[PDB]
Design a protein around this ligand. Structure first.
Ligand code: R9D
Ligand code: CL
Ligand code: CL
Lengths: 301, 305
């Protein structure tokens, strides 16, 4: 037993991380088969930060303006193309460490591991969720751009996030590995701010099911609720609406614990009303929302 | 910016994990050079585990009684011996993935990364502290035994923990890699409990420094204090005593924020007495004690391996 913020083993991603330099700018790239992926803003200079014309700045570059370093080795860039906000540098060596991989665009509430990297070297691994406002609450210093987020269900590495920038509230914005931003963000230093964030209701419920699996029952009650009455209460605490999809997804955790999804919804309503009364659930005095139903089943069974 | 519970990258350690089977028991082994390390309790049956004679059980075994699998490849065991509570299975082949490594024994309050594994397959990685009561608050299911805990210092992996057992309260006990238990525990099915735990004072103060560095500053105040006065408050709240050595180790963070440790201790004195008055610090309602000063300095300065 026990319950922890648990990241995927980072080794398969570690073997893909390289340093990309262009002009005076250095960040991380992701080396898969014969392609290095990195944020396109690497090609930006000081004045190219507000209104960069990426197609104009790129056509001015030769392959040899791009310095790609895998550990001590320099890779030879033989080709450059842009897809959305991601630069793809073709190189003359396929990465011998390339794992089984795919690119997946995730939805708000999904979790993933982040391999924070500086100068193409890994610093740490941790868990994040895509917030409802399409940001992530990461840990990222200058030079971390090109760090990626991933899942590793069943030997295949699913790349779902590449880090581009920090917003003024200290949260992080980035793209899928096809270069499309999560949320309404753009790779320009024009004033941008995340929408008001909300709590990922379905994840909070999954975590209370985790608490019950680990032998805690103090917060349960003899009440139930309609889905509609639950949503009318929850949204007064800035909780995401719970959908019939969210109810379906919790069916397996409902079956394992024998507590109906809407019974657990009643427990959450009361928790929101009462707080914890000096108690903790799985070592938190707050309601945790960065574990999905899938995460709880992976870790508890 | 941002501040997260952050494990070391686990790649160097993933390439060392194998499956070890003896009779009906499978668990994990650590393959370094030409030796596989695992818990000695792999040699026991249910019946053995109530009062095991490890000497006696071990001599009865032979090399071919130990099935060691690295991926889809059997390793040949050419020797077996025991060091304290760890079994050492000498194999015919050195791990070509062996990293630069030491075996290190850590102090309570020190943190490390756990690579939870099942059937020799790495499953997840998380940060832990060795609690003052010598337990770790892990996340382990059946077949997790032989999972290991480590730090990285430059390119050298320091292995500090091997998983042996779960105590009745859901917390975890194991050994260093020389097979010495952390805490007053033994590898037998008998009655064992975690001592009452205490809070790691120097780590809480490190995490307050991380909060200030990330612009969470509400708990700061005009007051200062002394070790003696603070330590009477600490003792009252089941907090480890703060030594002069801890103040020196916080020196860097105290500098970089212009809060002196006894200035911060005055902040912490007030939180224990008053609570958080409905607030959070770095998205926690609790006083987090599983980040060391080194953890905070490294994460906030982007140190790389
Ligand atoms: C060329 O180096 C850079 O990355 C720029 N100096 C900074 C930068 C530009 C755009 C953006 F969306 C994020 C960051
Ligand atoms: Cl998704
Ligand atoms: Cl997040």
């Amino acid at each position: 037993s026990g319950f922890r913020k648990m990241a995927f083993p980072s080794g398969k991603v570690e073997g893909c991380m390289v340093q990309v330099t262009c002009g005076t700018t250095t960040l991380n790239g992701l080396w898969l088969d014969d392609v290095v992926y990195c944020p396109r803003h690497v090609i930006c200079t000081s004045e190219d930060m507000l209104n960069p014309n990426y197609e104009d700045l790129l056509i001015r570059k030769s392959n040899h303006n791009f310095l790609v370093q895998a550990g001590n080795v320099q890779l030879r860039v033989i080709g450059h193309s842009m897809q959305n906000c991601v630069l793809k540098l073709k190189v003359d060596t396929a990465n011998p460490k390339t794992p089984k991989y795919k690119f997946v665009r995730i939805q708000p509430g999904q979790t993933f591991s982040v391999l924070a990297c500086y100068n193409g070297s890994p610093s740490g691994v941790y868990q994040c969720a895509m917030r409802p406002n399409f940001t992530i609450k990461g840990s990222f210093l200058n030079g971390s751009c090109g760090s990626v987020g991933f899942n590793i269900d069943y030997d295949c590495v699913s790349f779902c996030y590449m880090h581009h920038m920090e917003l003024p509230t200290g949260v992080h914005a980035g793209t899928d590995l096809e270069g499309n931003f999560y949320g309404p963000f753009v790779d320009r230093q024009t004033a941008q701010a995340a929408g008001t964030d909300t709590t990922i209701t379905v994840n909070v419920l999954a975590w209370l099911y985790a608490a019950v699996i680990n032998g805690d029952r103090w917060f349960l009650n003899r009440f139930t609720t309609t889905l509609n009455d639950f949503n009318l209460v929850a949204m007064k605490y800035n909780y995401e609406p719970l959908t019939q999809d969210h109810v379906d997804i919790l069916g397996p955790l409902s079956a394992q614990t024998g507590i109906a999804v809407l019974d657990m919804c009643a427990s959450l309503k009361e928790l929101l009303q009462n707080g914890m009364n000096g108690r903790t659930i799985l070592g938190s005095a707050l309601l945790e929302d960065e574990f999905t139903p899938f995460d709880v089943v992976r870790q508890c069974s």
